[PDB]
Each structure stands twice: as structure tokens, then as C-alpha cells.
Amino acid sequence: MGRVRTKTVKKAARVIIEKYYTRLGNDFHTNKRVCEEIAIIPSKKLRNKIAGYVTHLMKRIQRGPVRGISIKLQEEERERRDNYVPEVSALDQEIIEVDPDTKEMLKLLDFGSLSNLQVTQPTVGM
Amino acid sequence: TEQMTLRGTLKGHNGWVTQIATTPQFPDMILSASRDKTIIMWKLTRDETNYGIPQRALRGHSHFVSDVVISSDGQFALSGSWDGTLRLWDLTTGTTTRRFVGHTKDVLSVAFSSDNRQIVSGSRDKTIKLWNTLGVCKYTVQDESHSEWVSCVRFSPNSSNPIIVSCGWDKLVKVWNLANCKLKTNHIGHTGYLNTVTVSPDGSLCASGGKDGQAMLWDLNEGKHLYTLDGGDIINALCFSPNRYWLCAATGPSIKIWDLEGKIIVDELKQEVISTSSKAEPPQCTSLAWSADGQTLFAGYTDNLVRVWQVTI
RNA sequence: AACGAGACUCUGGCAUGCUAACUAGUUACGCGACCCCCGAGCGGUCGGCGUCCCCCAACUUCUUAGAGGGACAAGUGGCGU
Numbered sequence: 321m322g323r324v325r326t327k328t329v330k331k332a333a334r335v336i337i338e339k340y341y342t343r344l345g346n347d348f349h350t351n352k353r354v355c356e357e358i359a360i361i362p363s364k365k366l367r368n369k370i371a372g373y374v375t376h377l378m379k380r381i382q383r384g385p386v387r388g389i390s391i392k393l394q395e396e397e398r399e400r401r402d403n404y405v406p407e408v409s410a411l412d413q414e415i416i417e418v419d420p421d422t423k424e425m426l427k428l429l430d431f432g433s434l435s436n437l438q439v440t441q442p443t444v445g446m
Numbered sequence: 447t448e449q450m451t452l453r454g455t456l457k458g459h460n461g462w463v464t465q466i467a468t469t470p471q472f473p474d475m476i477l478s479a480s481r482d483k484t485i486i487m488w489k490l491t492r493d494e495t496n497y498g499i500p501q502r503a504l505r506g507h508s509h510f511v512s513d514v515v516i517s518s519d520g521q522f523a524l525s526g527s528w529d530g531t532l533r534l535w536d537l538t539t540g541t542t543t544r545r546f547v548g549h550t551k552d553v554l555s556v557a558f559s560s561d562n563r564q565i566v567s568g569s570r571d572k573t574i575k576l577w578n579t580l581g582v583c584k585y586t587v588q589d590e591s592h593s594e595w596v597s598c599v600r601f602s603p604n605s606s607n608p609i610i611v612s613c614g615w616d617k618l619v620k621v622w623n624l625a626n627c628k629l630k631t632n633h634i635g636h637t638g639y640l641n642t643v644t645v646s647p648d649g650s651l652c653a654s655g656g657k658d659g660q661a662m663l664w665d666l667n668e669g670k671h672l673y674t675l676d677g678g679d680i681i682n683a684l685c686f687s688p689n690r691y692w693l694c695a696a697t698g699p700s701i702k703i704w705d706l707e708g709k710i711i712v713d714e715l716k717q718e719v720i721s722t723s724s725k726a727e728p729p730q731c732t733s734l735a736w737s738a739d740g741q742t743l744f745a746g747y748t749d750n751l752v753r754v755w756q757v758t759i
Numbered sequence: 760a761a762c763g764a765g766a767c768u769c770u771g772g773c774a775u776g777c778u779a780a781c782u783a784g785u786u787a788c789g790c791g792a793c794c795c796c797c798g799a800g801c802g803g804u805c806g807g808c809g810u811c812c813c814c815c816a817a818c819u820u821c822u823u824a825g826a827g828g829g830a831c832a833a834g835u836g837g838c839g840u
């Protein structure tokens with residue numbers, strides 16, 4: 321059978337997408353002409369294979385981002401999430417509270433307010 | 447209340463439907479260019495069990511047919527296909543009367559004069575071309591033209607001093623004096639390539655859309671930019687109204703029709719809603735055409751179908 | 760990163776779209792002619808057979824051979840981290 325594309329086709333398609341991301345659509349007969357005009361493919365069969373892998377990649381970039389092509393539109397949605405967001409707030413409630421042998425530890429470095437306690441069953445798995 | 451209703455559907459094609467054109471002379475015949483290299487002229491039998499039958503298939507083209515337009519008398523058609531050639535047909539038999547050779551790449555658009563005296567064609571050569579009606583090259587816009595694909599060209603309907611307008615893949619709307627064939631003014635904006643362009647029947651506005659998804663209204667007299675409508679997904683074809691102040695827009699799977707008075711959407715023509723079990727759920731919308739009666743619009747899709755939508759009260 | 764595989768070259772399949780052809784043809788009738796009624800009819804006019812003869816007829820469907828086009832797992836449904 322075959323129909324397994326080669327690295328020469330996949331790398332070409334990845335570069336074509338990573339540079340001309342906004343000229344490429346979802347149909348094959350237009351991506352063919354786009355790649356024909358932006359690059360120099362010295363064959364027609366290679367042109368069709370590259371333009372056919374470009375379409376299969378485009379159908380995926382509309383979903384979650386692939387891990388070999390980096391574009392501008394899909395980087396902002398990372399960048400603007402790596403900066404803080406109102407889903408997060410501060411430490412969620414600033415009345416966080418501890419158990420004994422920590423208050424016994426905190427006493428040895430002069431702490432004195434806003435805590436709680438509990439004592440467990442006396443050993444693991446009971 | 448004015449509403450739209452799905453009257454019927456026309457069948458007979460094999461690929462995408464790319465253009466639909468109606469003439470005000472014969473209200474019972476439609477032209478439909480498709481990607482199966484043929485152009486179907488329909489027998490519009492107004493019944494409701496079906497709605498139309500193909501009457502005759504204008505054949506003879508070596509690739510996709512990108513544009514078609516009917517003459518003013520209804521006896522001729524002009525066509526432009528993806529082999530660079532234009533064809534002048536005879537709506538009575540077929541028998542292409544004249545082929546307009548001369549281009550190096552596919553022919554995207556085609557338009558006919560008000561008196562059917564000049565012809566204009568835009569292609570992927572970044573070349574606008576004017577032709578005599580006998581099949582010879584009148585004039586070529588080689589430079590000061592778009593730097594990319596000239597996606598669409600149109601004539602203004604005005605007898606008052608004449609405009610032609612062209613949109614391209616260089617995100618620009620350029621306007622020309624038809625006598626001189628030089629630039630009149632530019633129009634900047636539209637982040638992304640341009641799919642279509644159109645002129646209102648009063649010859650005063652140009653509604654341009656494209657990849658951006660926003661339809662912009664430009665003024666042909668003031669030389670300014672009136673306003674913008676975010677069309678949502680993407681714009682394939684924009685068409686004005688014959689007897690109303692609307693603007694029909696072909697979005698991806700839907701058709702958005704605005705009342706321009708208060709710039710408000712009237713309707714969202716969505717087809718049936720089967721749970722398409724993966725991927726892009728709907729067949730997208732390519733072209734649309736308003737009937738000279740202003741009562742029904744025809745829409746050509748990407749799934750080989752042509753649907754009708756009637757204005758109901 | 761390099762070679763080999765693949766890509767590559769020739770070939771077979773498709774174009775009533777282009778280019779253009781008495782050292783290839785088709786159709787038409789100009790024809791003209793032979794033959795038979797084999798049809799209405801008369802046998803003539805209309806037809807039927809012709810690798811019989813002509814056209815400075817119109818054309819490229821069949822023939823030739825160049826340029827481009829066209830297929831990409833592209834479309835749709837399943838199975839796939």
C-alpha cells in the first residue's frame with residue numbers, strides 16, 4: 321500500500337504552514353495553488369503531496385494545537401493565560417490552619433495567632 | 447414581519463456550486479456554474495413536489511468554472527474558468543460564440559457592462575483585463591494593480607461617470623475610472639484576503655468582505671468608509687437587494703441578512719441540524735443571488751445543492 | 760548530517776478544452792458517375808451501396824504530437840494513546 325508520507329514532504333508542509341498560516345484554508349484545490357505560488361517545488365506529484373498534507377494539518381490546527389508548528393494566533397492564547405487570570409485569585413482563603421507539632425514548631429520561632437488543631441488515630445491505616 | 451422560508455432545492459450537479467446568476471428579462475431560467483466543469487441552465491418549474499430541472503448543460507471547459515453572468519437580453523452568457531479562458535455562450539443552443547484567450551493563470555471573476563459593450567476579467571496574474579465584445583484585448587492593468595490575486599472585479603451600474611472596482615488578496619479595495627483605467631482612490635483595512643465585492647443598485651456603496659469576517663461599506667461618491675458589520679465566521683459572497691435596503695451575506699454554514707436601517711440582522715438562514723458525528727459539521731455556503739422579483743434568493747453550497755429561500759409575510 | 764528507500768526518467772489509462780495538418784482524416788454538399796428498386800414513386804425527385812473521381816468547401820470527432828490539466832488517502836463513515 322504505502323500512503324505514508326516522507327520527511328521531505330512533512331518538513332516542507334510544516335514550514336509552509338509556519339510561515340503562510342493565514343493564506344491557507346480547508347480545501348485542497350486552493351492550498352495547491354497557494355503552495356505553488358509561495359514555494360518552488362520541482363515536480364507536480366510532490367506539489368500535490370505537500371498540498372495534501374497541508375490540508376490534513378490545517379484540519380487539526382482548528383482544534384487543539386499541534387506540537388511541531390508555532391503560529392501567532394495560538395501563542396497569544398498561551399501568553400494571555402501564562403499571565404495571571406481571575407480564575408486563580410490569591411491563596412484561596414488566607415485563614416489556612418495547622419495541626420499540633422507544627423504549633424509546637426512555630427512556638428520555637430515565635431508565632432502566636434490564627435491556627436487550629438486536630439489529633440489522628442494513633443498509627444497509619446487504623 | 448418579513449421572514450425567510452426554505453421553498454425547495456435543485457439537484458443535478460456533481461461538485462461545488464460556485465455562482466448563480468439571474469436576468470430580469472426571463473424570470474423562469476437560472477444559470478448555475480459548478481466545479482464539475484459544466485454550467486447548468488435550469489427549467490424552473492415552479493411546482494412544489496420539485497422546484498426545477500436542468501434544461502441544458504453548457505459544456506466545454508478544461509477546469510473549474512469560477513464565474514458566470516447573464517447578458518441583459520437573456521440570449522448570451524459570459525463565463526470564466528480555471529484554465530484562463532473566457533467563453534461567450536448562446537442560451538438558445540450552446541455553441542460558445544467567442545473565447546477570450548490571453549492569461550497565464552486561472553480566471554477568477556467576470557463582469558458585463560451596463561450595455562454589454564466592454565468585458566472585464568480578473569485573474570491570478572494580478573492582472574485586470576478589459577476586452578472588446580469581439581474577443582480582443584482592449585486594455586491591461588499591469589502595474590498600479592493589486593500585488594496578489596485579483597479575487598473579484600465589478601462594474602458600477604451608473605450612467606453617471608463610470609467606476610469599476612476590484613478586490614484582491616493584497617487586502618485592498620481599488621477603484622478605477624472606466625474611461626481612463628487609472629486609479630481613483632484606495633481603501634485600506636480588511637485584515638486578511640478579500641473574497642468578494644459588490645455595488646448597490648443605486649451605484650453608491652461597495653460592500654466588501656473576505657477572510658476577516660467583517661463586511662465593510664464604502665461610499666463610491668464621498669471616497670470614505672461608512673461603517674463595518676462583523677459578519678461572524680467568514681464572508682464568501684455579498685449581494686445587495688433589488689427592491690430593499692438589505693445586504694445578504696454568505697457566511698460559512700449560514701446566511702446573514704441585515705436591515706441597513708439601524709444596521710441590524712434580520713435573519714440567520716441555517717439548514718438542517720443532523721448530529722454530524724465528527725469534524726466540520728455543515729456543508730459551507732459559496733454563492734447567492736437575488737431574483738429580479740426581489741421575492742426569492744438562490745444559494746449555492748459546497749455539497750452540490752442549490753437551495754431557495756422565499757420572503758414570506 | 761551523509762548514502763540507499765522515496766523523490767526521479769520512460770511507459771499504459773483520460774480531455775468533443777488549446778495548438779494544426781492534401782506525407783492523416785471526417786462531414787458536407789459542389790459534385791459527376793456506376794449500379795440496383797431495395798422505399799414512397801416510375802425507373803425520374805426523394806432516398807440506399809462505394810478505399811469510384813474531384814473541392815483555392817468547413818472542420819480536427821477518429822490519426823499524428825506538442826503545451827498544459829488531472830489523484831492528493833482530497834470527500835464521507837468506522838478503527839486508531
Ligand SMILES: [Mg+2]
Pocket residue numbers: none
Ligand atoms: Mg537523525
Ligand SMILES: [Mg+2]
Pocket residue numbers: none
Ligand atoms: Mg477518515
